[PDB]
Design a protein around this ligand. Sequence first.
Ligand SMILES: *[C@@H]1O[C@H](CO)[C@@H](O[C@@H]2O[C@H](CO)[C@@H](O[C@@H]3O[C@H](CO)[C@@H](O)[C@H](O[C@H]4O[C@H](CO)[C@@H](O)[C@H](O)[C@@H]4O[C@H]4O[C@H](CO)[C@@H](O)[C@H](O)[C@@H]4O[C@H]4O[C@H](CO)[C@@H](O)[C@H](O[C@H]5O[C@H](CO)[C@@H](O)[C@H](O)[C@H]5O)[C@@H]4O)[C@@H]3O)[C@H](O)[C@H]2NC(C)=O)[C@H](O)[C@H]1NC(C)=O
Lengths: 273, 493, 313
Amino acid sequence: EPAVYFKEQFLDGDGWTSRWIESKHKSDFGKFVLSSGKFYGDEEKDKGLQTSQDARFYALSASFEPFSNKGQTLVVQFTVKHEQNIDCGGGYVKLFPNSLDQTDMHGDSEYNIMFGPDICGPGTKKVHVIFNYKGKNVLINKDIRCKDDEFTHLYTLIVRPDNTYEVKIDNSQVESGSLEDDWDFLPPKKDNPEYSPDPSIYAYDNFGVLGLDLWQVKSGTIFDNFLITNDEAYAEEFGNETWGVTKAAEKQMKDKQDEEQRLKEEEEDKKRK
Amino acid sequence: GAIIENMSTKKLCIVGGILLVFQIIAFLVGGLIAPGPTTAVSYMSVKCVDARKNHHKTKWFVPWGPNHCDKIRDIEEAIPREIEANDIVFSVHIPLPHMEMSPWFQFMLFILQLDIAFKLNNQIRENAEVSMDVSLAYRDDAFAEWTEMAHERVPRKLKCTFTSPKTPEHEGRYYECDVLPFMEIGSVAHKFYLLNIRLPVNEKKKINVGIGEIKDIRLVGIHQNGGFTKVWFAMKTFLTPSIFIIMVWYWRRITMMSRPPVLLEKVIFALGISMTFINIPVEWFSIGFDWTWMLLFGDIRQGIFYAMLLSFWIIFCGEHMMDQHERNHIAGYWKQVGPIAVGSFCLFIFDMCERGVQLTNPFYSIWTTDIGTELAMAFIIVAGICLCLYFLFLCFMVFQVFRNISGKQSSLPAMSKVRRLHYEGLIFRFKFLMLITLACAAMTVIFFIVSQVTEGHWKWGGVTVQVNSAFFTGIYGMWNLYVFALMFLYAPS
Amino acid sequence: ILCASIPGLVPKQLRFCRNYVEIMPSVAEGIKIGIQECQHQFRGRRWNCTTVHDSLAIFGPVLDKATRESAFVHAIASAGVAFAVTRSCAEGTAAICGCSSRHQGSPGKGWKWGGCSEDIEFGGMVSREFADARENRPDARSAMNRHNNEAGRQAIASHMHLKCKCHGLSGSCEVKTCWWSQPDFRAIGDFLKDKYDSASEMVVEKHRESRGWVETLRPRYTYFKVPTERDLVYYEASPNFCEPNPETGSFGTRDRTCNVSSHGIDGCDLLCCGRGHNARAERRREKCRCVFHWCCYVSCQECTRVYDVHTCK
Ligand SMILES: *[C@@H]1O[C@H](CO)[C@@H](O[C@@H]2O[C@H](CO)[C@@H](O[C@@H]3O[C@H](CO)[C@@H](O)[C@H](O[C@H]4O[C@H](CO)[C@@H](O)[C@H](O)[C@@H]4O[C@H]4O[C@H](CO)[C@@H](O)[C@H](O)[C@@H]4O[C@H]4O[C@H](CO)[C@@H](O)[C@H](O[C@H]5O[C@H](CO)[C@@H](O)[C@H](O)[C@H]5O)[C@@H]4O)[C@@H]3O)[C@H](O)[C@H]2NC(C)=O)[C@H](O)[C@H]1NC(C)=O
């Protein structure tokens, strides 16, 4: 059965004011706003969490019901629209245990897991994932390319008790593999005398907080349609219902906005000369 | 009263003139003859490569000459030769080529500075420490084997900052690392010294891990300049017989009295003993023998003079309170001499904990660890507090005694002729010493500040005059003549 | 081998080579380090100190012109010679330089009496006696060469930080010792790059004290000001670097690459001199996830990563 560990679409318009706790670790943190963006497919189903200040560190997080994935599949999902097409900025999520005092968190706070696209500089455009393990923060070996444009896109992560994972983008698989084969948790086998397997790689003791702490140069991007659950099929159907319904409407509407821009620009060029 | 009370103005003037002539000679001797205090040669360490034969067998690597080591110019050349850490040794030969070190260079300082190169993937960790496996040896002739002198771990903390933005556009630029102190030896007694620095690395122990990328090790050797020591000894061999003559004259003039000496005369004689302790050129034995403790002994010998002179001023001011005390016993001066005695002992304990410990480990330095740093700073702070407290006591005493002098001076005509001479002579005798001491102290501080800001040389006409050496010789002459005049002018009639 | 294989030396340089034979490898090292810095500082600016194996002119005709590029090359070469000779004296491989007197009985300003102070002058001395020797003929080219060479040497002379250590009574600073510390040669590279961006153009003049002609350069003092022995000078306009042209000695950017994505370090649309700004993507193989000692040969594992090749026409 699908356990809804966390879920949000801001359908109430104001539930953010109660569910999220901003950090007061530093006084100059950027402040989020809730908006549907310059172009959207739905007026309310796309009104997500938006960055608004340029060249700022951001720190926002929301708590959820405690749970442990020991002996259970783990799923995380969210959607992002890059309204400003950042040249540098974070677009990822962090999950924390209940020990995190959300009033004081920052980029150096200890998370259980990290997931999301990371776009700073045109030289690196790869999705960023980091799993904590026995005091180590470990990052992936293989690479996954992130999406480019301002359009609203969906991201999803999945982890299984068989020490395997898979990555879902726009309700489509992009990567899959095994944890100890793709992360440097354990020393290499070659028989090396120090080697011994550990099945507990995929699991953590507890989780109780979902966090969005990051740096951006260009503000404007919006985050929406989050979900944390155990069921892969529940996440797939939620992603369909939350992103496929808007994909076509937003496509058409930003296409018509681009066409309006092209008319205005060409008629301005005609009038100016 | 004292002889100064009897001296006519003419004879006092001629004494002052002779003293000033000797003063100017003592300034010139350091000014023109002496070669300046200290040399500072800078060696680039030569990155020798271990031949892998030395698992346990010990051999020394030489940068140049015969049997020079397998040598690497740029440390990157290690990579395609597949050379690794624990094999690169930063060998240094102390006297630069075709030179020697001679016992007249009364000490050696060595301080390190590191050419750490910034690289995005190998930044210095926030609390990184270097763990050198230093070893040093000496030799006495260009063909004998090296024989070991020391072999010690030398951990140090990296105080390094990066001024350029931490951008891959600026990789390879060096950090601005501070000069970490390395070693001190109280006497050179052998002609050549060879020094090997190694940086063994171990990931699990984290020894020398994350200190950045080191391109080169620069080592600066400081020593007292060879001619300055000979000038210094030529001065001390002149001052010693003079002070012995003055001491024996003063002792005879003190003993040959009906009354026993007063406390002022005893402390004057004690100041004389303290200074004739400094004049005796026992350093001239250090050019023959291998005595490492010379620096500590010199420091204690100088401190005994400072802690004697600072007490002399207070005893002098106390012994001129005109009324209601007239007591001579030393025990009455606890409140004033206690601060300077405590400060002196505390600063002596600090100087012990550094310089005397260095006798067993030439690479030791108390500033390495936080416990030692805090303890040494506590000792220095207590010394400073004691000094400031003493100075407040001295200013209060000077104010009070001028109060007494003014009060008594408002009544001089009233009493008998001989007592009037006694008290007026006391006033003059006190004012003379305070004016002379203010002049000497102000002139010493002025020439000390000048030696701090000056380049070390001054071009006059066709010649160069040393400023730093003239300062040392001139101040030493100043205070020696001060003690001479003090002894002569304040002896009994 | 000494003073035989090297073809380009002028008689003063042959005499210097014959006398100070041990120094010459250090001078070669200085030339090499200077050229490495001039390659690094211009690795994007349409001209990147490209070397050619002809061995008669290792950069080709382009640096024979009195242009800012030749200005920078001469300045950085002089700074490199000075730096490398000073370093080699510091390593102790060179027995020639500085004070080299063994014993002095009477006051004689030697090692055992006065110490050594003349060592720090040696780098400037050798650099000026070597590099300026070939620039004696009183042409405008040679005057510019001398001024730029002195600018390069003064760049090293300016950036030497003074550091001090003190000892005395109980470790207090009554006896203070100070010495000059060499600057990192990358810093000199950036400083000369800054001077190159601010180099002053200035025009030639001709007159002689006797019946004949001698040349000198006159500043363009209408707006700018040139400080002697500090700023690089030139008098020939730099040629266009887009097309290959061996006559001027310029090689085209047909093979060069740049930060094509959305920008260009000096303009990708410009330095590419055409259109078509991407050529390949390559699966580069490299060591990765390494333990990273402080020195060398980490002997770590390796992996392959995809990089885009923005080589442009
Ligand atoms: C080609 O074209 C252009 C220009 O022509 C060049 O491209 C870029 O140019 C700009 C101009 O200088 C530079 O980009 C950015 O410049 C901004 C100036 O302020 C900065 O915002 C930004 O700084 C980032 O990188 C620097 C590297 O020094 C960091 O110091 C800085 O903190 C920024 O990194 C943060 O943000 C990244 C993206 O958001 C993160 O990926 C990064 O990890 C870091 O995030 C921290 O904070 C978050 C939340 O607060 C934490 O989650 C992170 O923790 C994670 O990482 C740490 C450390 O690894 C782990 O301990 C932890 O476990 C993890 O969770 C972090 O703590 C840029 O400087 C720059 O020059 C170019 N951009 C590049 C190269 O990306 C380009 O140079 C031109 N030329 C070429 C390509 O040759």
